[PDB]
């Protein structure tokens, strides 16, 4: 029987979070650090995310705005730099690891002057300002939250969207069930689990897409656009 929730795989919630915090504190503040030794796939990733996002930027009644985005689990700002800053007037970043947000100020260069808020906080403790963001981008971090905290964070995110705003999740997906990585202290969830969580947060899918051109050995990665 596959596991269907984090409550089947997490022995101790406080340790699940504290171990993850310690893990990221000892990762170098680099693209290869953000990508777990896969820094080389960054351009494939960014190109695909851009195309995915541009779907929602077309003129018409539901056009997503371009005033402000929120990068969640932003790290040093890999995605902020190459995807979001070019498209959004301002960007806010949130991440638990202070050293990454400090590095971001260097990594982002001159364009980084348009990063407004650098929030150093776990997502589980973060309440984005209501009616503030056109796009909330959540990539390679949902496995760090329990199902309850993920559902709650998504509800809070919903409350922070501007009219026509969207949430984008892009992350590793398991073929089946909920799989614990006890080294980085994270989980990988199957598509049915993630969709369940999204539904419980009062959100709906606008689109879902598998990431192409990835190394064969890694978990499949999917993007979901939500409102």
């Amino acid at each position: 029987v596959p596991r269907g929730s984090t409550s089947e795989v997490i022995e101790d919630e406080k340790q699940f979070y504290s171990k993850a915090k310690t893990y990221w504190k000892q990762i170098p503040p680099t693209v290869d650090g953000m990508l777990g030794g896969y820094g080389h796939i960054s351009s494939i990733d960014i190109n695909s995310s851009r195309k995915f996002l541009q779907r929602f930027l077309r003129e018409g009644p539901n056009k997503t705005g371009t005033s402000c985005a929120l990068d969640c689990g932003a790290g040093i700002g890999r995605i902020t730099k190459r995807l979001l800053l070019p498209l959004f007037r301002e960007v806010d970043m949130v991440d638990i690891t202070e050293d990454f947000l400090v590095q971001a100020k260097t990594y982002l260069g001159e364009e980084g002057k348009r990063v407004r808020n650098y929030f150093c906080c776990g997502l589980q403790d973060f309440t984005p300002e209501p009616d503030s963001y056109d796009v909330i981008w959540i990539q390679w971090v949902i496995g760090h939250l329990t199902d309850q905290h993920l559902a709650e964070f998504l509800r809070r995110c919903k409350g922070s969207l501007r009219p026509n705003g969207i949430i984008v999740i892009k992350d590793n997906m398991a073929q089946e069930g909920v799989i614990l990585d006890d080294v980085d202290s994270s989980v990988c969830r199957d598509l049915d689990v993630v969709r369940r969580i999204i539904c419980s947060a009062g959100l709906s899918l606008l689109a879902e897409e598998r990431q192409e051109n990835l190394p064969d050995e890694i978990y499949h990665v999917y993007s979901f656009a939500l409102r």
Binding site: L35, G36, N172, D181, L214, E217, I218
Partner: peptide, 6 residues
Amino acid sequence: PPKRIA
């Protein structure tokens, strides 16, 4: 991050 299937 992206990672090898365990």
